[PDB]
């Protein structure tokens, strides 16, 4: 029961960012620190999930195959919105058989210069929005992305990166089952691209963290 932690995403002017770390855990064990968790689905779309990695693999396989087959047999290239709809129907169906997909998905993409971002949870709940997250992202990240998007006229690409990294840094600080190693995908100009892994700068040197002040007994 290889399982993925937090995923986060944010829309900016011209596209959308999705980010996660490259770790699969098993309970508390950090088992694989070099797994690429994001999956390209078709021409415009990218998905990721928190939860059971086996259930993510199975569900994205099924989806990627529908999308590639539909395109190859004359039925055109499915869009983010269509992919998203099909995902939510299958999540729901499985819940309805009591054999759930124990994952929470975030889906992103760009078609017709309109960026998509939405979430689907394991009983089939779906929503779109300017910022979505799964895992401890929903508790730790969303308060920051939401504050950031309060500004009027929206976010530039660079301001969207800065705030994505601050969230990453807090996950790394406060989420147990994480690591300092992340990728970002960027949907923009009707195509998705996945970056190389990177690390964020952290702080550990405050005077209030020193040995004498944190000592339980003087």
């Amino acid at each position: 029961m290889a399982s993925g932690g937090s995923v986060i995403g944010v829309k900016y002017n011209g596209g959308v960012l999705l980010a996660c770390d490259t770790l699969l855990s098993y309970g508390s064990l950090a088992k694989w620190p070099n797994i690429p968790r994001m999956k390209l689905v078709g021409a415009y779309t990218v998905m990721c999930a928190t939860g059971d990695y086996a259930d993510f693999q199975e569900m994205t396989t099924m989806i990627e195959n529908h999308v590639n087959r539909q395109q190859m047999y004359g039925g055109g290239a499915l869009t983010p919105n269509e992919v998203f709809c099909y995902l939510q129907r299958h999540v729901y169906h499985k819940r309805s058989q009591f054999e759930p997909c124990l994952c929470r998905f975030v889906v992103a993409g760009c078609h017709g210069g309109e960026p998509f971002l939405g979430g689907v949870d394991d009983v089939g709940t779906r929503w779109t929005d300017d910022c979505v997250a799964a895992g401890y992202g929903a508790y730790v990240a969303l308060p920051l992305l939401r504050q950031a998007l309060e500004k009027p006229g929206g976010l530039t690409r660079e301001e969207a990166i800065r705030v994505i990294k601050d969230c990453l840094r807090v996950l790394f600080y406060r989420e147990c089952r994480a690591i300092n190693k992340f990728q970002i995908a960027d949907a923009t100009s009707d195509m998705v691209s996945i970056g190389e892994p990177f690390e964020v700068e952290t702080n550990w040197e405050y005077d209030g963290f020193c040995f004498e002040k944190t000592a339980i007994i003087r």
């Binding site: 195959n65 590639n68 087959r69 190859m72 047999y73």
Partner: protein, 227 residues
């Protein structure tokens, strides 16, 4: 002469006449040629047009079965189409169950098996098409034909349909160790234009596809600016 009404029956000479007759459909359909080259496979078919008011892309005889494989149906088109759906299920099966693009020899085997079975049951009839299979998977360029009997054979070059005896004579003058996908598109198109009968079929267009190293081993109709 009751011996020719079901395909579940030998004749006294050991023939299966329902299968012969279905082969006659193919032999009176339109002419297709194909060539297995150094860098890929090329197929060309001649569509006899029943009407000047058809949109282009109507009654396509060439279909993709997988990223790397395609078929050209010669004979009755809707029969051919049922064969295309099975071929895709097979190709999908191989990726789903065995994680591999289907090999070309294996896909042709499975198509044959499928056409064979409609040669043995009183309740069905043989298919009235032959299927050219063009592939380029991990086994390299392959060109197979399956026919209504379910016989499958690999080829360097081939021709089916009414023009097929002349087309075969011209395909014999090629050189199959040298010839590329680019040269073949030219030569096969010339052969379909020469075996074409102008008295009988006034309206036609050519369809032509390929799977080569150029196309990044993807089966696809050739871009229309190359004829």
């Amino acid at each position: 002469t009751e011996h020719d009404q079901s395909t579940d029956i030998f004749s006294a000479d050991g023939r299966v006449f329902q299968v012969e007759y279905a082969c006659k459909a193919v032999d009176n359909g339109s002419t297709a040629v194909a060539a297995c080259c150094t860098d890929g496979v090329v197929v060309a078919v001649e569509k006899i047009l029943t009407s000047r008011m058809l949109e282009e892309g109507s009654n396509d005889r060439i279909h993709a079965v997988d990223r790397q494989a395609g078929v050209c149906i010669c004979g009755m088109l809707p029969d051919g189409r049922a064969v295309v759906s099975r071929a895709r299920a097979e190709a999908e099966n191989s990726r789903d169950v065995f994680a591999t693009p289907i090999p070309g020899s294996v896909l042709a085997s499975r198509i044959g098996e499928f056409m064979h079975v409609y040669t043995t049951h009183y309740a069905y009839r043989p298919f009235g098409c032959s299927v050219i299979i063009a592939s380029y998977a991990d086994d390299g360029p392959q060109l197979f034909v399956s026919d209504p009997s379910g016989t499958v054979a690999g080829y360097y070059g081939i021709a089916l349909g009414k023009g097929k005896t002349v087309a075969k004579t011209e395909l014999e003058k090629l050189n199959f160790k040298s010839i590329t996908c680019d040269e073949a598109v030219v030569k096969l198109t010339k052969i379909l234009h020469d075996v074409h009968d102008k008295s009988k079929d006034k309206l036609y267009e050519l369809e032509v596809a390929w799977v080569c190293n150029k196309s990044n081993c993807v089966f696809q109709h050739v871009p229309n600016d190359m004829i």
